Structures are given as structure tokens and as C-alpha cells.
């Protein structure tokens, strides 16, 4: 997106676009409440079969 | 108690519809407290008028097709959602829209009521392609506050909902978008102060500043229960 924007618009637009992407990216990452539990590490039921 | 109140510094009015506001210096932690509490009332609780029901002739439902007309009936309803209307006296007005021949049907083609002001008369509502074709509809505007969709109205009201009446999502609160940001207030000794910066997005019926003033009033009216 920033490579496209750099070649179409210029330097100024990209610098502001890159920032706004950073701002919204952090903020909506925070909203999401994405996490890491032990159940999030799904194992296939057929592992002991394959081995 | 070292009560430090901010005061309204500068109101950068970029347009009558979009205007920015800087506030300083606010006491630390009240940066986001008022910013959000206000944003919430301004999104959902603000009063204004909006298209609720429409009834076009030659139309049994919103999915059907009218010959000689560019937009599907859904896309016409979408244009009426975004039709700015201010009813001065009454809480409910049903406006009539009849028009024919080749032209983009604008908001000025609606018959204006003695106490009804259509805020953007050049607002497109439908496009007539054929000269032979003509469109007729009855647009009901009601007043409320905040945002009441067709889905959250069919859930609440299971009263009269007859076939052919097209429901349209109401945008009563004149506020289209609203955003508050906070960075950092530097004073003499305090440096952990914050300065609230909200950018409210209105339609034109209500002024940015006015809307904010009303939202603070509704909040203070809730504080009447808690004495001081």
C-alpha cells in the first residue's frame, strides 16, 4: 500500500498515510483484545495416528 | 481540592458542517473521561429528524423494480437516509414527492411544508432516465435522537408494519462522525496534564458547538439526582 502510494502520490502523502495506518492499526489491535491461551494451540486429533 | 477547570480555547471552523475544537488545560485523566462520555451521547442520544417510512407508487416492496429509473429502490432509500431535514413545529411530517421528465430528482422537488426546511436542496434522491417516466412517493420524517436502524425497530415495535411501506434507517442525530483525541498538556509544574481534542462531524441542521453544548446539558441534567 505504501509502495503504491509512494509511486502515485509522493513523499508527504506516504509519511502521513504511514502514520495514520500505524495509529489505527494499534488502536483496532487494542480493541480486538486478541490473546494467547493454551486452548488456542489446537493439535490435530490424528497426530498419534500419523506417528 | 485544587479544582483546575479547562476553558474553550479555539474553535477552528473549517466548514459549518465540520469544525475542530481545542481544550486546555484539562486535569490529568479527565482527558478521556469527558471526551468519551460526550462522544457516546453525541453518537446515539442526540435529537434530530430523519426519514423513517417511504411509500413509492408502483412499488409493493424495496426489492422490486421501477422502469425508467437508474437506482434500485434500495439505493433510492439510501439517498433518503442522507436527506437533511429540519421539522420546526411538529414531531412528524409526511412530505410528498412527485416529478417527471429527464432529470436528477433533487431534494427541491419535494413540496416544502410551512414549517419544514430541506437543508440540502441539490441533494440527489433518484435519477429519471426516460422522459416518459415519472416518480411519486410519500416520505415520512419523524423526530427522535441518536441512530435507530430498521433492524432495531422491527425488534422493538411489532405493531403495524403493512406491506408496501418501505422502512428507512433514521439518522436523527445530525452527528455523522465524531472523534476525540488526547496528547499532552504542558503547564509550569504539571506535565502529566492532557488536552482533549474532539472533531465532531455534523450534517448542517445542528451546529458542531451547539450539539456539544446540548450533550453537556443532558449529562448535567442526569447529575441533578446526585445533589451537588
Amino acid at each position: 500500500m505504501l509502495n503504491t502510494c509512494y509511486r502515485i502520490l509522493g513523499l508527504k502523502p506516504t509519511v502521513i498515510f504511514a502514520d495514520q495506518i500505524m495509529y489505527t492499526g494499534f488502536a483496532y489491535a487494542a480493541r480486538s483484545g486478541a490473546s494467547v491461551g493454551i486452548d488456542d494451540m489446537v493439535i490435530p486429533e490424528k497426530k498419534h495416528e500419523i506417528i | 481540592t485544587e479544582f483546575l477547570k479547562p476553558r474553550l480555547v479555539d474553535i477552528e471552523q473549517v466548514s459549518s458542517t465540520h469544525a475542530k475544537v481545542t481544550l486546555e488545560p484539562l486535569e490529568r485523566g479527565f482527558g478521556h473521561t469527558l471526551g468519551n462520555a460526550l462522544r457516546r451521547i453525541l453518537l446515539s442520544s442526540m435529537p434530530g429528524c430523519a426519514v423513517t417510512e417511504v411509500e413509492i407508487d408502483g412499488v409493493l416492496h424495496e426489492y422490486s423494480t421501477k422502469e425508467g429509473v437508474q437506482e434500485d429502490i434500495l439505493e433510492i432509500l439510501l439517498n433518503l437516509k442522507g436527506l437533511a431535514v429540519r421539522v420546526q413545529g411538529k414531531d412528524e411530517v409526511i412530505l410528498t414527492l412527485n416529478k417527471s421528465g429527464i432529470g436528477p430528482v433533487t431534494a427541491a422537488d419535494i413540496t416544502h411544508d410551512g414549517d419544514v426546511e430541506i437543508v440540502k436542496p441539490q441533494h440527489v434522491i433518484c435519477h429519471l432516465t426516460d422522459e416518459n417516466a415519472s416518480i411519486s412517493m410519500r416520505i415520512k420524517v419523524q423526530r427522535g435522537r441518536g441512530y435507530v436502524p430498521a433492524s432495531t425497530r422491527i425488534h422493538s415495535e411489532e405493531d403495524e408494519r403493512p406491506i408496501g411501506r418501505l422502512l428507512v434507517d433514521a439518522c436523527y442525530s445530525p452527528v455523522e462522525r465524531i472523534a476525540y483525541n488526547v496528547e499532552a498538556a504542558r503547564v509550569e509544574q504539571r506535565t502529566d496534564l492532557d488536552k482533549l481534542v474532539i472533531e465532531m462531524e455534523t450534517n448542517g441542521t445542528i451546529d458542531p458547538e451547539e450539539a456539544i453544548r446540548r450533550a453537556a446539558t443532558i449529562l448535567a441534567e442526569q447529575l441533578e439526582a446526585f445533589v451537588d
Binding site: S32, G33, A34, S35, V36, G37, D39 | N36
Partner: protein
Amino acid sequence: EIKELLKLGDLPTSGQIRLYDGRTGEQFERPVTVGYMYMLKLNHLVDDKM
């Protein structure tokens, strides 16, 4: 064994709880892993490093 112990304290199997943003008050979109991790203050302190 851990999940079994979680049920003894009337806490979820998941070890993920619904948290709410302190600023806003509204909920985060999904359950978030929360619990007690024993952390340690290392000797690399910034008053010395600056």
C-alpha cells in the same frame, strides 16, 4: 490439572476472562488471557544506563 484447579476457584477452563477498557468502559471484542505471572526486576535500571 490446571483446568481442574481453575474450577475449584470458580474460574473458567479457558483462563481467559472478559476485560473492559478502563478509559472507555466498553468490552474488548474477545476474551483475553489474564492470570498471575511471577515477574522480576532486572539490574538493568535506566537511572544508571542514561
